[PDB]
Design a protein around this ligand. Structure first.
Ligand SMILES: CO[C@@]1(C(=O)Nc2cncc3ccccc23)CCOc2ccc(Cl)cc21
Ligand SMILES: CO[C@@]1(C(=O)Nc2cncc3ccccc23)CCOc2ccc(Cl)cc21
Lengths: 304, 304
């Protein structure tokens, strides 16, 4: 029992963290095999960020202009290329600590762990989610760029995020491991606004199922609702529309607790309309949406 | 910018996690040098837990009765001893992944990272704090016993907690790495009640300083207070008494923001008396007390 915003063990990802320097700029890189991945804005100065032509900036950069430092040893860059908003630096030595990996592009709503790094050194690890507006609410300072987001399936690291930008609103924007940004964000120092942040409904339902599993059952009511009725209420509260797929995914948690998914929706509906009334659920005074139904089952079963 | 309940990178602690079996019981152990530490209740059956004489139970256990499995290889137990509520199994092979370590007994209020394990395999990592009633609000299932709590100073792991027990209230009880329980808890299956959980005042103040640093400044008021006046209010709300030492420790965050510690106390006083009024601070609808002032500076400066 107990329910925490538990991140994946980061050891397998720490072994991939390197420091990438280009001129004055220094950020983090992810060394897997003989390739180091990092945000392509490593080639920019602060003046270049305002309006950068990365193709042009890159021309005035050679293999020796990139300094990759793993731990305290220097790596030899034997090739360089730009894949979307990431630089792929081919080094002459394969990472001896390269785990089994996949580069996956997650969907908004999915949650991953972030290993925040500075100078190729991991400083901490936390769990976060891809917001429906394709931002993350991370904890990143200057020099955290190149830090990755990941999931782990037994011994396989699925890299899904690379940190590039902090938006003026304090939210974070980044790319998948193929250099493509999540959302409309561009790696330019220009005013970019984050869209509406909606609440990932299926996740709040999953954390309500998690609460019932841990004894917090006060919010359980005598009512039920329909998918369409629940969604009219969800719409008003800027909550994601709940679909039959979401109900399907909640099936396991519905079976575990014996509470139908539409009964849980009615409890959520009353929580949305009536408020928490001073009470807490899993020590939280608000509805938590950064636990997928997969995170709840994993934490309440013990998947290692 | 951004503020998360960020745990330390767990890689250095994953390399110490082993599976310890004794008869039918299987829990986790911490292998540092040629010693594997684990909860002494590994020698008990479910009937023994009701009233165990560990000295007597241990007599009917020999070196070969303990099965330590690291990864997928078996370790040879060449000696065994009981230090308080922990078993110290001396193995013939020193852990090649043993980091620089210290065994430290933390004070209530201090926060550490937990690497939750099952069968010697790390399943996840989260940050938590030693409650003033010497319990932790962890996330532990059956088989998580032997999971450790730790802090990291650059390359040195300070082990401070070992998980032993879940109390009927869903809170967790454990020992330091010398086998001594935090609080009055005993490793017996007998009704043990957790005392009053108070709010770690100095930590809530630190997370208020962290909020101001991240732009959330709505709670800042035009008032100040005295230490004695603040404490009368803190007492009523079951908040820890604030001492001059706590004010001293908040000095750095006071200097960073230019907000005096007693001005921040007045903001906290109004937050306690008036409530959040529907608003959030750092995305939280309640006052967070599981960030020490050291955690705030570390997260807002980038200590790796
Ligand atoms: C190159 O770094 C930028 C940035 O936001 N990086 C950051 C990312 N995280 C946390 C940050 C905390 C403080 C300072 C910067 C942070 C600086 C502003 O202009 C831009 C413009 C585009 C891009 Cl792709 C990045 C950036
Ligand atoms: C030996 O394990 C016990 C326990 O609480 N362990 C646990 C610790 N964490 C999470 C748990 C989740 C579910 C089941 C047990 C959990 C079982 C009950 O009796 C006792 C009595 C004393 C002690 Cl020192 C431990 C224990």
């Amino acid at each position: 029992s107990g329910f925490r915003k538990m991140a994946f063990p980061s050891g397998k990802v720490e072994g991939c963290m390197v420091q990438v320097t280009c001129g004055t700029t220094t950020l983090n890189g992810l060394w897997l095999d003989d390739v180091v991945y990092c945000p392509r804005h490593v080639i920019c100065t602060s003046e270049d960020m305002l309006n950068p032509n990365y193709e042009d900036l890159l021309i005035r950069k050679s293999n020796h202009n990139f300094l990759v430092q793993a731990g305290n040893v220097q790596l030899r860059v034997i090739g360089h290329s730009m894949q979307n908003c990431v630089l792929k630096l081919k080094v002459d030595t394969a990472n001896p600590k390269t785990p089994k990996y996949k580069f996956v592009r997650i969907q908004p709503g999915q949650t991953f762990s972030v290993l925040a790094c500075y100078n190729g050194s991991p400083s901490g690890v936390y769990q976060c989610a891809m917001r429906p507006n394709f931002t993350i609410k991370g904890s990143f300072l200057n020099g955290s760029c190149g830090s990755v987001g990941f999931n782990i399936d037994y011994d396989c690291v699925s890299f899904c995020y690379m940190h590039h930008m902090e938006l003026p609103t304090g939210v974070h924007a980044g790319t998948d491991l193929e250099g493509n940004f999540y959302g409309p964000f561009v790696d330019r120092q220009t005013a970019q606004a984050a869209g509406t942040d909606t609440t990932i409904t299926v996740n709040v339902l999953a954390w309500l199922y998690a609460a019932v599993i841990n004894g917090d059952r006060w919010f359980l009511n005598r009512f039920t609702t329909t998918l369409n009725d629940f969604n009219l209420v969800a719409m008003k509260y800027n909550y994601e529309p709940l679909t039959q797929d979401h109900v399907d995914i909640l099936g396991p948690l519905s079976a575990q607790t014996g509470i139908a998914v539409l009964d849980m929706c009615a409890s959520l509906k009353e929580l949305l309309q009536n408020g928490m009334n001073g009470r807490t659920i899993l020590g939280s005074a608000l509805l938590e949406d950064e636990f997928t139904p997969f995170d709840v089952v994993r934490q309440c079963s013990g998947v290692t």
